[PDB]
Amino acid sequence: MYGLVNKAIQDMISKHHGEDTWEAIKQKAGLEDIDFFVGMEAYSDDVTYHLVGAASEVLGKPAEELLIAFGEYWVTYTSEEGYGELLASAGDSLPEFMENLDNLHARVGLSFPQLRPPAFECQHTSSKSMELHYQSTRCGLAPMVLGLLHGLGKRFQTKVEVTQTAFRETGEDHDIFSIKYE
Template sequence: MKGIVFNLLEDAVCEQYGAETWELLLDDAGLDGVYSSLGDYPDAEIQAIVTAAAIRLNVSESSVLHWFGETAMPLLKTTYPEIFEPFHSSRAFVLSVNTIIHPEVMKLYSGARCPFFKFQELPDGALQMTYKSSRKLLDLAHGFVMGTAAQWNERVTIERFPAGSARENDMIIRWLAD
């Protein structure tokens, strides 16, 4: 995993819980926490930090990943406003993830292995998004979608399906009218 993900997680934790909490999470995970944004690090390290956060905060790992995704979006927008500028809505931004966002990520962070998303517009106007990645971070993607909507002051609901079901990697996203 690219170091930028670790940097974002550190920023999110420090902003909400303080730098001491980040240090405690690293200690709990048995990691030194020195992450260069361009560096590559084992996926197991992000998992160890997420597990440590779940234990320390007494929440599920799923909740930690969701929180991280949602919290990371304003940090990303501040750091890379040019990625957000061309879009008029969170829906347009989400739909561009494979064709614009992830190619930009790969330009910035050589060797990044981004997930792939399959999209299907549903008759009721909802968007079905299917997550494809060996990393199994659908909860993070869920948080990213929620955080993206917040960047445009939009509200969304996300329907998920049970783990182990044929649709466990699908989300149904509905944008709510104000």
């Protein structure tokens, strides 16, 4: 994943737990070499998985819990770190934003050549609910999607309830979330 993702994880941890904790995580993750992350540079996906595993051990939180928190954080981090207009352009309500997500990542992918974005498809079931299909080249990031959706709820001052109804882990084709919103 691009350095931007790893910087945001670093930022989230460093802000909540301080630099010493960050340095321990960095060390345990096997990254003491890397002096800083470069936002627009591509890293091995392993860098991100190791950082998360190491943060889990050092902080004593399951990795999935940290992914949820990171998902929520990302919505705020991107708005403040160069992508606030891009976010605004993706809509002014939760359901519209989710319809625009693939288009938003298409736009991101202009600037980030090697992007491997997720694919999201919405099947609306009412004016207050939708099924969200999430497909990815990567494993284990469904909890991050959960936090993202909650971050977007906060963004749009909209109450949202998100329940995953299909899990790749149980052998399903892809993750599916049932979403209800104000």
